[PDB]
Write a protein that binds this ligand. Structure first.
Ligand code: ARU
Length: 349
């Protein structure tokens, strides 16, 4: 009845199979993309032993019960696998290539670790698809666990790396995008640099070094800005490009959308500003007595991190990207299930 494609998102914490049915319009672009099946397994691919028994157990658990035969499959790993040397990755892909050759139910089209730029492309396509803006300047930011992505329209520029630019034609229109991924600036990886910063945690929160939190979002933001700008040079790379290529609307996916959906934060219309984010983080968490807070919200296991995270998002978007602290940032809410793999259907199916 419809075309079908499978995309496996092999992420740092788990792998997620998505089977989509779609139709194609007369520009040769997928439409009516529907997720018909879904399977999620932990831990991440890069966290299992790369031998046949382990890979077989893992992929069987992921795929065996799929209600669909003879479908093309894309196996796309992201930041978790990017953290591994090429020679380690090879062990996984040798086993995986062999496993798929033993299954005629699944036609492996590609298995690879996509670059963060690739992932930025798919992010942009996925968001703009959900927003129905694709047949129509929309910027997308993905705040992931290990890497962060930014992507916005920008005219082809021969003085910028080809790796940071993508040309595509979508619903009949030629598009050029600037794409950038910062590996290490994802919230989990970045957090590992700041666990002993008392400025980044609720008062009396027990830091690993035996010291106590003493939260202050402006100070915590400054510490994080050092990693963004002194180490990753985010400001130098992104700000001159945004000054010249203004974005009309920002959309964010990933961790922002989770934090903004917490009980401790108040945001309407699935949008926020950096100023409000930082202020609420500073008041509700950074300067808050930890034990009292923890007692009031005992189920939220991300709570302890909200001072750091609010400071980190502001640092990234404001001090890094140069986004105005009062500029509206839309976020796709967690309930909505927007997935970057929708971008792969658009681009590759
Ligand atoms: C009550 C408020 N909740 C609970 C919902 C939350 N509050 C704050 N952060 C949350 C969160 N739930 C999840 N996160 C974090 O969101 C960040 C990025 O999310 P993502 O989903 O975007 O991370 P990602 O990069 O795609 C992942 Br799954 Br780590 P993989 O590499 O593909 O496996 C990750 O680092 C998560 O740890």
């Amino acid at each position: 009845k419809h075309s079908c494609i499978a995309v496996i998102d092999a992420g740092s914490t788990g792998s997620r199979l998505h089977i989509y049915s779609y139709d194609t319009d007369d520009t040769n672009t997928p439409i009516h993309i529907e997720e018909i099946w879904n399977k999620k397994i932990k831990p991440g691919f890069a966290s299992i032993q790369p031998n046949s028994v382990t890979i077989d157990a893992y992929l069987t658990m992921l795929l065996a019960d799929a209600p669909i035969h003879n479908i093309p499959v894309y196996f796309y790993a992201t930041a978790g696998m990017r953290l591994l040397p090429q020679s380690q990755q090879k062990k996984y892909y040798d086993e995986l290539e062999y496993w798929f050759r033993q299954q005629s139910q699944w036609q492996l089209v590609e298995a690879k670790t996509i670059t963060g730029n690739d992932e930025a492309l798919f992010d942009w396509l996925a968001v703009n698809y959900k927003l129905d803006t694709l047949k129509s300047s929309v910027g997308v930011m993905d705040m992931g666990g290990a890497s962060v992505q930014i992507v916005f329209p920008m005219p082809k520029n021969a003085e910028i790396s080809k790796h940071n630019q993508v040309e595509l034609n979508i619903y009949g229109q030629n598009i050029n995008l600037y794409v950038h991924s910062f590996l290490g600036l994802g919230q989990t990886e970045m957090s590992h640099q700041f666990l002993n910063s008392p400025s980044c945690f609720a008062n009396d929160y027990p830091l690993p070094d035996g010291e106590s939190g003493q939260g202050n979002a402006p100070s915590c933001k400054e510490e994080v800005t050092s990693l963004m700008n002194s180490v990753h040079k985010v400001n130098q790379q992104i700000q001159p490009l945004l000054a010249l290529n203004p974005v009309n609307e920002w959309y964010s996916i990933g961790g922002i959308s989770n934090l903004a959906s917490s009980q401790l934060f108040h945001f309407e219309n699935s949008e926020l500003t950096n100023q409000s984010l930082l202020q609420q983080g500073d008041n509700q968490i950074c300067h808050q007595q930890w034990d009292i807070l923890n007692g009031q919200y005992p189920d939220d296991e991300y709570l302890y991190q909200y001072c750091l995270l609010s400071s980190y998002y502001y640092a990234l978007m404001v001090d890094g990207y140069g986004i105005n602290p009062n500029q509206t940032i839309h976020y796709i809410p967690p309930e909505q299930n927007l997935d970057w793999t929708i971008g792969v259907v658009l681009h590759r199916a």
